[PDB]
Design a protein around this ligand. Structure first.
Ligand SMILES: [Fe+3]
Ligand SMILES: [Fe+3]
Ligand SMILES: [Mn+2]
Ligand SMILES: [Mn+2]
Lengths: 326, 334
């Protein structure tokens, strides 16, 4: 344990060593006693681990060949019903990624007063930018009208309904006067986390994944499928991180987790399930090979139950998973 | 993709007025853009921002990919002098928190006000890159068995480092006020001063004496693991600087009324002060010479790069010094 002479930096500000961070004073929220700019010592090892795992998942949409997809798309082989599924899913995802990434930067990051958790957030937000690039790349490859696809959430009622709900559940977190140092403020902040991690990423996105990955399984639009596989790998970590963050904030601030807040979260999850079912019905008015809307009634309920359990809430639907392969 | 558009390949609107929200390319602006929907990436207007984003994405690296065995062997040996160790430690000290300062300013100050989705795409890449740089300094500390708390706290313990970061805080301005807005001449000028403080001064000047000293070791075959990590950080920082210059010049072009003789002078004076603090930091790092490095060389170098930064944002060079380190403009193959 011996090191050469001169391997330490000498301080010349004599009071400065007091600013070294005490690991145990670190908190996920409302932490202003210690220096948020120093990463070390890392307290939340789960956050750092998610960061490292995310970094190991580097990919770019432009690495994925689209030749076979373009050839299929331009042919007469796809039914109009199949094209409808693809188009509605591209319309929803094209802007939803932006909504998620903007909320991380503009709502979440300020109030997560912890450097290792913020490291992960920076990785997550970049990953949402990659997902956006994906949708641009798909549109350009297939020769879709990119404005028509990206504007879908303003033109298609079942998509608009999901993102209008998302706006509601975002709450007042963007307001200049919003703070998390009240019980009510921190409850609102947690509802925003549930809205984006549990509902948007954890329910809305997983349902679109099934539709697209169902094509991939049939050897149709395999390039889009492969991109969605990479997106799913990322979203798995986004969800695990968000659940950890929610559970961590609960643990450190047990006064927020009232029966009232719990019921409010349950009610928002129910509303999200109903919207996602409506969206699946809009995607599948008749149903295509391997996919019918009735399967989504079961699937959306099933995943909602899994998300509820992860944040300490009772399952409510008790439906089986009709897509075991997911 | 040049084949016929097939029947049924359009998605039908069931909200008839919704088409009005498709974004007109000519309505997009870098700041104060409330006329169009910021959540839609397309159509891309600022091709330069998108190019920076694609270039950054092509530069993926991780500090953990760079072997540290030879550096550990050298650090543990008597073949590195006390003065050489001081250069390494002060630079690690400064960089370890500077990356977090830059990244936090991107997210908390810049992103809100850059009202354009392609520029925001680049910002998210840049902020992630700053996290990679932070990881790099943790990895170096752990690799060499340095006291991580000592290194990351350097900016509170060393006067020449604190002086730089205190200046940085000042030049951040009032942009963090949650009621700060860029929708006035004064507001937009303050925002542009923040961009100058972070892109031109922090990233474009304060990082450079450090890059020279560390890359000088790498050229001598000393601490080549740290050197390689600094080469990757340099490649990133070059793109960060180019983007910030492009953004400052684009904001000026779109809002020429902000670029007054008074603002121009204020910017020059900020850059002059940054030069003085950076020269003082180089003197702190180098009380005595090491091979190919002396504190006095940094007077010329820091002034030379400050002139180059000034020119790029349309201001006249003021120092006219030559570059003592012309190898720094040598294409590195990574
Ligand atoms: Fe996500
Ligand atoms: Fe940078
Ligand atoms: Mn995503
Ligand atoms: Mn950096």
């Amino acid at each position: 344990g011996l090191v050469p002479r001169g391997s330490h930096m000498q301080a010349d500000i004599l009071d400065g060593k007091q600013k070294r961070v005490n690991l145990n004073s670190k908190r996920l929220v409302n932490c202003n006693q210690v220096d948020v700019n120093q990463l070390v010592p890392i307290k939340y090892k789960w956050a750092w681990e998610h960061y490292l795992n995310g970094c190991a998942n580097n990919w770019l949409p432009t690495e994925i060949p689209m030749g076979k997809d373009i050839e299929l798309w331009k042919s007469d082989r796809l039914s109009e019903d199949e094209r409808r599924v693809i188009l509605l899913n591209l319309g929803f995802f094209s802007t939803a990624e932006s909504l998620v990434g903007n909320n991380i930067v503009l709502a979440i990051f300020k109030h997560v007063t912890n450097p290792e958790a913020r490291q992960y957030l920076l990785r997550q937000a970049f990953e949402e930018a990659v997902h956006t690039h994906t949708f641009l790349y798909i549109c350009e490859s297939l020769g879709l009208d990119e404005k028509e696809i990206f504007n879908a959430y303003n033109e298609r009622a079942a998509i608009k309904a999901k993102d209008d709900f998302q706006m509601e559940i975002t709450g007042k977190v963007l307001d200049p006067n919003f703070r998390t140092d009240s019980v009510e403020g921190l409850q609102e902040f947690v509802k925003n986390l549930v809205g984006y991690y549990i509902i948007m990423e954890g329910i809305f996105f997983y349902s679109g994944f099934v539709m697209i990955l169902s094509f991939h399984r049939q050897n149709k639009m395999i390039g889009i499928g492969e991109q969605y596989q990479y997106i799913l790998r990322d979203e798995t970590i986004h969800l695990n991180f968000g659940i950890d963050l929610i559970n961590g904030i609960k643990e450190e601030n047990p006064e927020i987790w009232t029966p009232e807040l719990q019921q409010e979260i349950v009610e928002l999850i129910k509303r999200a399930v109903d919207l996602e079912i409506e969206y699946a019905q809009d995607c599948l008015p008749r149903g295509i090979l391997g996919l019918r809307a009735s399967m989504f009634i079961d699937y959306v309920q099933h995943i909602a139950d899994r998300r509820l359990e992860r944040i300490g809430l009772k399952p409510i639907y008790h439906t089986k998973n009709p897509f075991p392969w997911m």
